[PDB]
Amino acid sequence: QKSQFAYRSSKSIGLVNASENYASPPKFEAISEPARNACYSPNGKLFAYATATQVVINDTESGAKLTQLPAANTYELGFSPLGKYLSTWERPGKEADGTPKQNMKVWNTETGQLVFSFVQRNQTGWNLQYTCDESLAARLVTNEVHFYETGNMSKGPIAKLRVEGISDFALSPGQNHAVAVFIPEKKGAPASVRTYSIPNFNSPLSQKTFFKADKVQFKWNALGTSLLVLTQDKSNKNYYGETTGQFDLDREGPIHDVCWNADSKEFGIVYGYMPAKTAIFDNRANVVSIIPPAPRNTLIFSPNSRYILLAGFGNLQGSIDIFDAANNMKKITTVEAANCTYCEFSPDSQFLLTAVTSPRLRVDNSIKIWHITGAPMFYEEFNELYQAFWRPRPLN
């Protein structure tokens, strides 16, 4: 329909229908206060932006304001998978008497009701995780993991997890709800990774342990069946879990990016000291494609799982290449976006957005939308641009 994206600069904030000669939906206008943050719901039906005083939820079709949240001093925002809940991280603190304040609260989007409120100090892993049906939520306590019913989480944890000494965890986005958890290294014991079905707390699905591991990184695919695991000062190594006791490098050095494919059939890796080589796999850990060493640090799959992007960010001279899984890994396009700090396919995988953002860069902030062929369709100069992103659509 309309190729809509959002933008927020130091000067303004708005939604832009690229199919409409780049105009905003008629019923849209921001708050008195300057915006400090913004985001879309996973299905792109809603838009939220944060100002000092309040938080406003709009309709991405009309731009019409829908909901008002009395959330002040916010820094982070997050939509639940079906956008029926929105979480707001504030900066932590203590109450008049001395009580720690409820930094992050959960809100309803069609009633504007404060359903819940937690105390937290971290910004990393702040939000609740959710199932895809948005029926279950998950919080992280020392040496425990809590589960909730999203409909009625006020009553408390409907379920808890047995295992002890949990450092981080990650839910499954499959049809049937599953969990993946991690235990940091202690004395006389290595780190460990665990998977559980939510029905089965009693019966683990995987129980693996890992050494010289203080940290970890989980990467489920769209189908909650397979799961990548990454051990990460002196060394880094990459593992694989497939739920079920399943385990499955050509260049010595760091892995720069790890990414699944939208169809959950393939995945790729940007690894080793530069120029970084790139390898595409299958759901089995077998190579499909070997992209030769190039100055790249970032890999992205197109939503339609047809195109593969390979770029270099975090520095100047940032080019972009686009490869085609269907055409024998042909390259069809090479563009450059120097100092690009953000890049993303349009929902229909036909266009490509690039941007340069502050404070990751205080010079040359801009927006540029590209065809999949290489032909630009838009460009806009900013002084201090903060974010710019597509309005996500499902199964277009």
Numbering used by the authors: 3 to 234, 238 to 248, 256 to 260, 265 to 412
Give sentences from the paper.
The eukaryotic translation initiation factor 2A (eIF2A) was identified as a factor that stimulates the binding of methionylated initiator tRNA (Met-tRNAiMet) to the 40S ribosomal subunit, but its physiological role remains poorly defined. Recently, eIF2A was shown to be involved in unconventional translation initiation from CUG codons and in viral protein synthesis under stress conditions where eIF2 is inactivated. Based on these findings, eIF2A might be a tRNA-loading factor in unconventional translation initiation events, such as non-AUG translation initiation, and an alternative factor of eIF2 when the active eIF2 is limited, due to the stress response by eIF2 kinases. eIF2A is predicted to contain two to four WD-repeats at the N-terminus and a coiled-coil at the C-terminus, but this prediction has not been structurally confirmed.
Since the C-terminal region of eIF2A is predicted to be highly disordered, we prepared a C-terminally truncated eIF2A (residues 1–424). We determined the crystal structure of the C-terminally truncated eIF2A at 2.5 Å resolution. The final model consists of residues 3–234, 242–248, and 256–412. The crystal structure of the truncated eIF2A revealed that it adopts a nine-bladed β-propeller fold, with the same overall topology as the regular β-propeller proteins, involving circularly arranged repeats of a four-stranded antiparallel β-sheet motif. There are two molecules of eIF2A-WD in the asymmetric unit, and no significant structural differences exist between them (the root-mean-square deviation is 0.98 Å for 391 Cα atoms), except for blade 6. The electron density of blade 6 is not well-defined, as compared to the other blades, due to either the crystal packing or the flexible nature of this blade (data not shown). However, the central channel of eIF2A-WD has an inverted structure, with the wider opening at the top and the narrower opening at the bottom. Furthermore, the opening at the bottom face is constricted by the inward twists of the AB loops in eIF2A-WD. A phylogenetic analysis revealed that the surface residues on the top face of eIF2A-WD, including these loops, are highly conserved, in contrast to the abundance of non-conserved residues on the bottom face. Especially, the residues at the top faces of blades 6–9 showed strong conservation. This highly conserved top face is positively charged, and the most positively-charged regions are the grooves between blades 3–4 and between blades 6–7.
